[PDB]
Amino acid sequence: EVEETLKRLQSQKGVQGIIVVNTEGIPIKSTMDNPTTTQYASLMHSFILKARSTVRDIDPQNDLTFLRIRSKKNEIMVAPDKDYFLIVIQNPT
Amino acid sequence: EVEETLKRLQSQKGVQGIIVVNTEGIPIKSTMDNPTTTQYASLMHSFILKARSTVRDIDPQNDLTFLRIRSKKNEIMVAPDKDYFLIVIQNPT
């Protein structure tokens, strides 16, 4: 259930529902400010594609589903399955 | 100190290999062999530079102080502040 996942992700602190970004960099789900989320998600897509290239350089059997990008203000967890890239903003606390 | 640092950072999980990197990529230290350490750490250096730009995109004041990538086959670490670039090869579990 999509709404079940929405309420489950909403329960996580610092999180506003569930937002999912496809391989186009445009989020399939709308939860935050559209221009900022689209440009930032395109940047995430570029970096996960290049990280995928490097991990396949030396680990041609590995898959990426976890990446901890934290700053001193907020953290993003980005999770690609095959096309859907979940992104969750979460405070370090 | 150097040797105590690597010893404590390795025996904390019996890590397969870690070297100290206080420069921008291209490390000459080794733990298992020269190539798989040096080239991989240089590629990590390029990618953490790109990720630093990526996180400065949302706001230039933000910086990446810590990066994890726990994939299906590798669990690779780095803690960049200004030039301290960690590398850790470890089991996903």
């Binding site: 399939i28 589903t65 999770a79 979940l86 370090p92 | -």
Partner: protein, 394 residues
């Protein structure tokens, strides 16, 4: 591509892998650890517009709790200088100058923010015209001005307040003669409703203060200049005064309903600040003054409840002291009390919507932002029950 194929692809039932992946990442990311009194708070005192010109009313923006609207009234130093001046002072950053300045041709007596328009200030003047100030505009003059016709106010207005829901607003105002009028916030050429407040047939009321109980807009409480407080109904078959209160033997110079919610209701309670140093903790359902705090030689000027404490309320004074009365703590000596320097006649108190810190007007235009201690500001869960017991005492 566009926002239609995404709907079908979400409706597609290949999402078992996605849902498992989401559940796993969320369950693994659940664990989170770390990486490693009364005090003078601030001043606000212009010099160009605040030479004498005592403060008249104060407020805080609901949308912008960092903003205070003042209204310095009296023009006696220089006849050629602007007559009414309302200054808005910001809380986020310290500036010696007011953020924004507004002047009206007449002398402003009261001002307040607009709930619907978070970029607008409405104020009332001494002549009797309700006056706007569109903060977008670069021009300091009033933007929209209500006519001084027999339809609208013709006596010095003293209470102006915008109430209602964001989709259904009404700017209520009352004048000294007692003609209540509701305007639409966006159109003020005509009073969209008006009615002259009158007691038992042929008895005009000299309204000089009011307050609406929290939530309610249909009925309210008014403090008259004749020392007799009333409750009235805004809309209904009984629109007008509906209650006698014996009240106090001096002019009512302030009024305020209870301003706390969450536990046992106290909207029926309010405090009136009389003109003989007698604040009156006292309710609508009863008719007799519940208690009659008295001290001092001079007389109070304004009183408000605390917006979060269900017991505390401030108290202006003539020799310049501001005191806070914590009924649950004590009913007899002010729980806290400090005097402003120079002992001038304070004229207005307004608590921040947060309730964590107080403001106060002055006889010389120097608005003072005071702060209160945490133990004296924030109540507890048991505080409401303690207030219930203290009121059940007598």
């Amino acid at each position: 591509l566009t926002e239609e194929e995404k709907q079908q692809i979400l409706h597609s039932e290949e999402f078992l892998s996605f849902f498992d992946h989401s559940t796993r990442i969320v369950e693994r990311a659940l664990s989170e650890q770390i990486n490693i009194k009364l005090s003078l708070n601030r001043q606000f005192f212009d010099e160009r517009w605040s030479k004498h010109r005592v403060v008249s009313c104060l407020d805080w923006s609901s949308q912008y709790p960092e903003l205070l609207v003042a209204s310095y009234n009296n023009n006696e130093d220089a006849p050629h200088e602007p007559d009414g001046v309302a200054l808005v002072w910001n809380m986020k950053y310290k500036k010696t100058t007011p953020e924004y300045v507004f002047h009206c041709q007449s002398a402003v007596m009261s001002a307040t923010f607009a709930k619907f328009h978070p970029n607008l200030v409405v104020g009332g003047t001494y002549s009797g015209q309700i006056v706007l100030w569109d903060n977008r505009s670069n021009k300091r003059t009033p933007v929209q001005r209500t006519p001084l016709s027999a339809a609208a106010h013709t006596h010095p207005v003293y209470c102006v307040n915008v109430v209602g829901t964001q989709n259904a607003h009404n700017l209520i105002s009352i004048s000294t003669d007692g003609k209540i009028c509701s305007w639409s916030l966006d159109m003020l050429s005509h009073p969209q409703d008006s009615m002259e407040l009158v007691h038992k047939q042929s008895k005009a009321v000299a309204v000089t203060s009011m307050s609406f109980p929290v939530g309610d807009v249909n009925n309210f409480v008014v403090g008259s200049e004749e020392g007799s407080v009333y409750t009235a109904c805004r809309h209904g078959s009984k629109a007008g005064i509906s209650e006698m209160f014996e009240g106090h033997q001096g002019p009512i110079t302030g009024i305020h309903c209870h301003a706390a919610v969450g536990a046992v209701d106290f909207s029926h309670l309010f405090v009136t600040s009389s003109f003989d140093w007698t604040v009156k903790l006292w309710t609508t359902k009863n008719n007799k003054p519940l208690y009659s705090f008295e001290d001092n030689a001079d007389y109070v000027y304004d009183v408000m409840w605390s917006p979060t404490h269900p017991a505390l309320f401030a108290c202006v004074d003539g020799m310049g002291r501001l005191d806070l009365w914590n009924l649950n703590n004590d009913t007899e000596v002010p729980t806290a009390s400090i005097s402003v320097e120079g002992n001038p006649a304070l004229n207005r108190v307004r608590w921040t919507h947060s309730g964590r810190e107080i403001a106060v007007g002055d006889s010389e235009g120097q608005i003072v932002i005071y702060d209160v201690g945490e133990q004296i500001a924030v109540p507890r869960n048991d505080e409401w029950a303690r207030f219930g017991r203290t009121l059940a005492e007598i």
